[PDB]
Structure formats: structure tokens, C-alpha cells
Amino acid sequence: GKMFFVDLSRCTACRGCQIACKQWKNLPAEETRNTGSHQNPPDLSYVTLKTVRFTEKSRKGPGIDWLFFPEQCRHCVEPPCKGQADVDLEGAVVKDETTGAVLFTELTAKVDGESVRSACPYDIPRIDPVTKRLSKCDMCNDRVQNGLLPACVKTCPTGTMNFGDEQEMLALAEKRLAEVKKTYPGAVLGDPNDVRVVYLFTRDPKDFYEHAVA
């Protein structure tokens, strides 16, 4: 299958990935207001499959630790979202055996949306309040099957976003972690044996987001 390696030690929170996701899919914009943060939209929703979370952690001396988390479906190797959806109706959540993408169909409207969301260790699923369809990151599965990089991976200027085969990315993840530790000694990989979106965090993953890791 395929794998993302997301090196957050290189992320400038440019939100190129946030706009690139919506441009490729032609998703609508949410109604937003500034409430004392650059973060917007403030959460994932039916129409927002990726938002960059901003967290400020106080530090000894000048400046802060500013932690950026471009959040998406981890496309789990054994997705608990599918396990729960399959209780109600098989074909609401399906898996691509070639890429490893975990895909929500419009049948999600006819399963317990609340249960499927609660089944996610990463709190990723979002429900359309009108149609009750579940929406999230689909890994740009169509682009990947047509030999293109996902829109958020191609757009990323810093080298934060990396994509390819499992073996290639796990190797890259292990090699990069060793180099990053020389600058960020508290660097760790997020649930590297369970998911296909492997984040490298510069410190406590939970400082990035409460559901950053399981």
C-alpha cells in the first residue's frame, strides 16, 4: 500500500495543503470569523477535510514553541471506522487493497454516524447535518491510482509532506527522525505501525493536538 510521511519539523503553517485540498475537490468555503487565532476553519467539518491547527506553548526565554498540525484521516491499516460502519451496513466504508486508502461512500448516511466517529481514535469523521453523510480525507485516491501525488503533498514547499510505498516511507521516516533529533531531541513518529499518515512531531504529539496520536 501507500504511505504519507509528514515531517512537522519543516512545517511553516503556510496552509498551502489546506487550500490545495479544497481546490482539487472544488469544496465550498466555511463561514468563519477571527476569535483571537490564525487557525481557521477552527475544526474539520463536512466541507473541510484538512485544517492546520495552531498551538502556542510557552518556552524558557524569547519566542515560543509554535506547533502546526495539518490534520487528516490517518487511513489506518486496520480502520476501526470500517469495523463500526460494517455493523450497520457493509459498503458504507470500504478499503482500496492496492493503495490502502480507507474510503467513505454516501451509504454512510444510512449507518450510525456518531458511532463511526467515536470508533475513530483520531476523531476524524465529520457528519453532514442535512444528508447525514460522513466526509474526510480520501487520500486523493483517484490521483494516486492515476500515478499523481495527493494535492496536499504536491503543493507543500518545505518537504513536510512526503508520499510513496509503505517500505520507502517507513525507511524515510526512520532516517529523517535520526537527523531531526539533532535539532529536536524530543522528536517522535505518530503510531508508525498502525497508520498510513505517519507524522513526525518535534515534541509531545499531544501539544500539537489532543487526538494527534491514539
Binding site: 511553516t12 468555503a29 483571537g36
Partner: protein
Amino acid sequence: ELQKLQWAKQTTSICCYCAVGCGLIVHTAKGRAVNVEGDPDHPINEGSLCPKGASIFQLGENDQRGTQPLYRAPFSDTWKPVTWDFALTEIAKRIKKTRDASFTEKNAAGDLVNRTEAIASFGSAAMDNEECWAYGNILRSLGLVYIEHQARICHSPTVPALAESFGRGAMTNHWNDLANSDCILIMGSNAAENHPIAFKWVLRAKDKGATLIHVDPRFTRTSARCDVYAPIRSGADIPFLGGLIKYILDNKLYFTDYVREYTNASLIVGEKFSFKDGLFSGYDAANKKYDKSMWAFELDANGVPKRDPALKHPRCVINLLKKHYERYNLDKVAAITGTSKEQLQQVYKAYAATGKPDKAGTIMYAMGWTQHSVGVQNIRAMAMIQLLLGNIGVAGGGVNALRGESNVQGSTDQGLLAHIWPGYNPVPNSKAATLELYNAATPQSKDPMSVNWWQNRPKYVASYLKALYPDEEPAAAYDYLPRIDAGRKLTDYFWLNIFEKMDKGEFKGLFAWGMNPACGGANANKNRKAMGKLEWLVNVNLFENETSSFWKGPGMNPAEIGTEVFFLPCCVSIEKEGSVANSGRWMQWRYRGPKPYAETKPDGDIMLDMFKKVRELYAKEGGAYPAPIAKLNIADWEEHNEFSPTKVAKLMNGYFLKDTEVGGKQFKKGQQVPSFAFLTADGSTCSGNWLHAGSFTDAGNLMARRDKTQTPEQARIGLFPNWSFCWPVNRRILYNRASVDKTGKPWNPAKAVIEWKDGKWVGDVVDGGGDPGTKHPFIMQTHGFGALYGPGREEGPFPEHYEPLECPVSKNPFSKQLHNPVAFQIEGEKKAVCDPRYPFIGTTYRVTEHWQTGLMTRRCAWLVEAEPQIFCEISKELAKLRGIGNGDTVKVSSLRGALEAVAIVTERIRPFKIEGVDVHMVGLPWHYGWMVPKNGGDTANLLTPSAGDPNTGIPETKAFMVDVRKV
């Protein structure tokens, strides 16, 4: 197959936003664009786009965009959709009428000037290079002198600052080259937000061991990815930089052989040079100016400045340099900057380490340094530091002045500023009565090692006049173009004074052509009012905007406004063919993906049809001095009754008007000039811009080259010399003769820019021909040296600390002079100097997601989504002191205006410890305007002062004083 791209045509383009110059691919319905994303084959972005580039589809296929031109009759409340034919004929009449009435053949002194002072023009760096040049020549053929654009209020200080220092005003290296640096100082720049793809190359520098340093008032998205962050108070840069000069000299961290051979360290300054208590010699208090002749070098009998190569003479530049910056000790710099003495030493140690010959330090700076009353002197200081450390001419070194708009480099190159023609040939003054007198101003050198390349200017001015008037002798055609008055300061003809004059009714007609001065001009209230006193405003833009609709903004009434506002809706970058010059001078060709939207067209087609109707009107009717208009070589711009970017680009490069022999080589009539080296003064050659000579040759369009193939030597520094074309003559790194010793051996063989062997230079194109050690390495300098001492600048030959015109301190600790003694101010206008009403430092800056005034990005739902409203960044300490909560509505006020913003209370801003007292700042974005979106807010330029730099007249938009209060 991907459904979305299945029925669409794939073309290449260049991003219409920042001067990184990222490659796009536009998928076009076989006919509107269906997709826009990055070009994976582009050597700068490698397919990457920031959120502005990634959203160009939402801009290009936007439903709020201008269909067909609108006409506002005077005193009216609404538009009326007119045709192309109505719009261009009526305007061509309005120009002609206003010109005929106010055209001045001779000035008050009785000198020929042949100009119109009743018409001004603003814009634009957003236009293609071909269109920018066409526009300038059209305005000048109409006799305009008041021709300005973005550059004035952006990097205008960079040009004289670096020209004084190195001999050219441009970014010395390029984006790819940053990866070669051993220490990247980011100061007066937020490169991770404002040049996002640049951080691809900054992080690759860090991968190979480079230390990343951000020095900024605020902790930003840039600061998050740097090894060292240090705060600095807005307007306190010279203290910091003067501190680093002293540090380098005391600790002997300078590159001795580089300094002695390649800088003016050894030159002897005349006895008439002195500096005491913040004033240099020759100060004229009554006229707010200096007698620069007091700063002249001691000359030998041949007129060559005297040198002491042992650097022992007390009036040697290096010894006068040591003496000036001895007052810049760590204790005083700490006291005035707010930067801790520990962090000064940390940053000083880290950067001065690159003084080592095989180590390269680079500076990345933009508006943080330029937008000051000491803008030129800020940049001079860093240029002087780079010369001391030998960082100029080397890979991973140089002064990386980060240009703003996609083609602001180009638009400056095409002379859309009041003081320059294309190619930085100055606009004649009233005392330049003949072309010979014009050329006589160019300083000569009797040093046999000084190339002094500007001595070739007569060939460029003659070839330029041939491009415009090919049937006239240059000496004859010279009389057609208008001239400014020799008696005045240059700053009388620049942005801020153009708006003061407009606010006195001295202008009839403004062209707001691809600019939004209602939001982009400093002191915006003044500008919005002043614009009421135009008899006709023309506006060429993508959307209806605050400028084109000033007549109804916060308190504007068509009850008392009489401006015939014309609105000409233009194409977007992806609907147009042409070139754009990026920050590294890379001139990149882009193609039409989609056809134009709703019967709208390119600026080139607009301005050519518009002017053609003037040319026709003057052929029928009479009118004042019609010779400049009738005779303009315009048929060389055209192919099929429309603007030909391809032909206009070939004219700029230039071709032989007859059969000629130049540089011991035979050329045939009609064929292209292969480089500016082969231009002539006798009328044998035309060339719209001598810098473009070599861009479009007989070999074809070199700007259109998409060749990433390199030699080993080129590949290990990422020159990409076969990708597009950069001026001058494909020299990717300026001043590269300084990268080698006097035998031609690189200081940094691992990262060599040029190398000597087979009796030729290998790698980058050598910046100045000649065998090793036979020429001084700065060929555009008169004397040929990197200028530590630069006596051409308005406020002295060394940078000296002066507080902003609105400052939070009452006493300069470096002198008795608080402010810049010759600073550009307007008589009457108020300044809060430690005013109790405005006790906080005011500064304005950008976020990643919005572009300029936001005119473009406030129409794009995905960018509004991310950054929907104007905000106000303040510390926790200031939030505490004023009882402001995170997210609360705050009112920010200055002497010139006030606005409402959402408070972002953050540890990313902290108090500045200035003279043992904690000074608080208020940060604002300037991306917002009253028109769109709902609750978005207005421009931060309501607060900004209409005063600043005496060299270039740039407003002080980065350091003023404000009050913030909860609502």
C-alpha cells in the same frame, strides 16, 4: 484517467503573486480553466504552491470579477456597462484635452521640459514586462513626469542602497542559491509567510549544516522553523547592524584579503569629511540637505581616489569606519533595540563566523528594513557587513533583497518611477539641454582596473531613443521625452508629494492602473479625499475595488464628488502571454491557458487601443506638441490588430536598424542584438531596455527556455543557467569576480560560482570580462570597489541611528539628533513623538493567505476562510495593562485615523526593554478594505504617516505610534 483534467488543455504559467516566480500548470477546457496547480518541472517550486498560488483557479474563475468596462459619470451613484469602443475613444479624448491645456514647452527658468504636470499614473508591478515598458513609453510620449508604481513604497530604498554599495540595485543572488548558505539571517523579512517556496531552499541550507536566524519584533511562522529567534524594536535596525560592524572589527572577524582588494577600505577620504553628534559635515539646516562635496575622496593627479593598501592612513575608509561604529557597544545597542546583550552576542557570533573565506552568510530582508525614514541606511549597514565578511559575489552569500510582486523587478527595470527611464538611465532634468549634456553626467574613471561599465550608457540611451523613434536621430528624438526641474528634490515627483499635490487640486487625471492606492497608499484618509479633486480617474483592475469606488467609502457622498471614474476590467495572468522578472532577475515566459473572461482583455491590448485612438485624434485635430505621439514606433508592438508580447519583447532586446560592425564582428540589418555589448550610440542599434539585450536573440526566446540541465560546477550551487534568462547577460550571481582570488581560484572551491581555466571562466557567466586580477570586481561602480563608505546617499556616507518620525523615546543615545536630519516630511502634518495619546509602537505586515490590499484575495473564499477579518496582535503584558481579552474588539488609533480589529493576544509579542523601560507595540495587517468581505474591516494605512526616506520618499509604514483601546 482523472475526470477533471480529461477534456482540458495543459499549458505552463508563472504565479501572479510574489517574486519567488513559482511555475504553474493550467488545465483549460478544450474554454475556461478547470484546474490550476504547481509545475513539477520548475526548478524553484518543484510543483509546490503556497495558499495564494494554490487558489489562482478561484481568482481566474471568480464571479465577482469585472465583466465589460463600467462608466461612472460625475456625481453619479452607480456604474453603466459601456463597450471597449466607447471607453477607449472617450478616455483618448480626456487625455488629449487635459494634456493640451497644461502642457509646458519650457519651465520658469526658460529650459525645455515638454511635459504635462496635470496627469499622474500609479502602476503596476502586476503587469507583464512587455506591458510595463509599453505603458511607461505611452505615458512619457504623452509628456508625463509623475509616473510611479509599487516599487516607490516597497524596495525603492534597495536600489540606491545597493547601487551605492555594489553598483546595481537588484537582489545579488537568487532563491535556489540560498541552499548553499552556512548562515541565513532573516531580518526585516517574514520569508516563511511572504516568500513561502523560499523556505524549500532555506531548510535545504539547514539540512547541510546552516544556522537559521530570524530577527523580528514578532515571533512568526518563520521564527518557528529557525535555530535562533531574537526580538528587535521597529526602527532599531541600524543600532543592531552598527553593533555587528564594531563586533566584526574589534574581534577581527572581517575577511582581510577581500576587504583590502575588493572593498574601498583602502581609499583616502578628504579632510572635509567629519561627523559629530549625529551630523556629518556640510549640513544645510535651512534647506534640510547636505553638501555631499564635503564627503569626496582624496584624488591622485589622474583623478583616481588615493589608496593606502596597508590600511594605515588615518583617513582610510576602514579606519573612519572603526571610528564611526565605536559608539555601537553591546550595552547601548541592547538599551535601544530591546534585544538582550546575550542574544546580540549569540547572533553576532553565529553570523560573523561566515567572515571565514570558505563559509557564506546571506541576509534575507524586505519591507521590515525598506519602509523607514532610514530605509537606505538600514540596507547600507547590512551591505557594509557583507563586504566586511566577504559574502558578496559568493554562493550562499550576497544581499537577498526579496522583491514583492511577480514583476516588480521588471516594472522597476521598465522605469515606472519618476526618476528613471528603462534600464536605470535617469529621466533628464531641465539642465540636460542636449543628449551630449545628458551623457556628460556619467562619471569617468582613469583607473586601468576599473571597468566602469556605465561609460557605455550613451549606446543604451541612443538605442532606447531608436526603439521609440527609429526614423529620428537620437539627439533629435531626445527633445520628445519630458524633463523634471533640476532645481527640486527628486522626492517632489514621488508618491507622497503626488498625493499632497492631488490634495491641493494640482492634478486633473489619475491612472490607478493595477494598484489600489485607497488602501495601498500610506495615510489612506488623505488619499481617499484628495482623489475627489480629480476631473477623471482611470482604473485598470480585475475587480471593482476601494480605489475605483472611493466616492462612497466611510463618509464619501456623490453629493460633493465630480470624478468621471472609468473602470477597464483586465485579464488575469493565466489568460495572458508575456514575461515576468522574479526577485533573482529570472525573466520567465508564460502562455495563455484560458481565453479572456467576459469580453475583458490584457493591459497591452487596452493601452495600445487606447493610445492608438490618441494617435488618430492628433492626426485629425490640432493640439500641443504632437510630435512625441505621432512618431512612436508602435507597429513593432503588433501582430493581428492586438498587443504582441513576442514582438515587444524582441524590441526590448533590440535589433540592428542597418548593417553594422561591432566588437570585431559583422552583423546584418534586421537581426536581433545578441547582448548589450553589441549596442551602439550612432543609431545602428535599437533596444527598448539594454538589460533585455540577450533575452530574445536570433537563437530564439531565452526567457521561454525550460532546461534544468547543468554542468557539475553549476549543479553544486543550483545556477540553472539554461532555465529562462536573467539580466545581466545570464549572470545568475552578481559581482561573482569577488568569489575568486586575484589568480581566479574560488575562496569556496566546494561551492564555486566561477573558476578560471582554458583561458576562460567556467560556471556562472563572469560579471565583467577580463583575465584574473586585471579588473576590480564591481564593474558598475565608478571606482570598481564595494563601498563601505558611500558618499552618494542623502543623510551621509555611513549609516547612523535616527528614531522613527513617530518614536517611543525622547533622546537618541548615539547623538543629539533624534530623527533623520534630512527626512522627507510634508509641512504642517503632525507626528506623535512620545505623545501620551499614542504611547505604543505601530507596525503593519502581511499574513501568508492574503495579497497586498487584499483586493484580489478578499474575493477568494478559501483565503477569507483562513483569514476572514483584520486583527490586532499584542503581548500578554499590553493586553493586561489595557484590560484586553483574546478575541475582543479593539480600536487602534493614530493622529491620522482609527479602525476596529479582533485582538490576537499572544506570547509571540513581548515588551521592548528600551532604556530600562518596557515599550509595547501594536501589530496590524494591511490586507483589509471597507468593500469586501462582510465584517472584514478597513485598511491599516488609515493609521500610517505620509513621511519617510529622503533618498526615495518611501513612507514609514513599519514604525509609527498608535493607541489601542477595548470597545
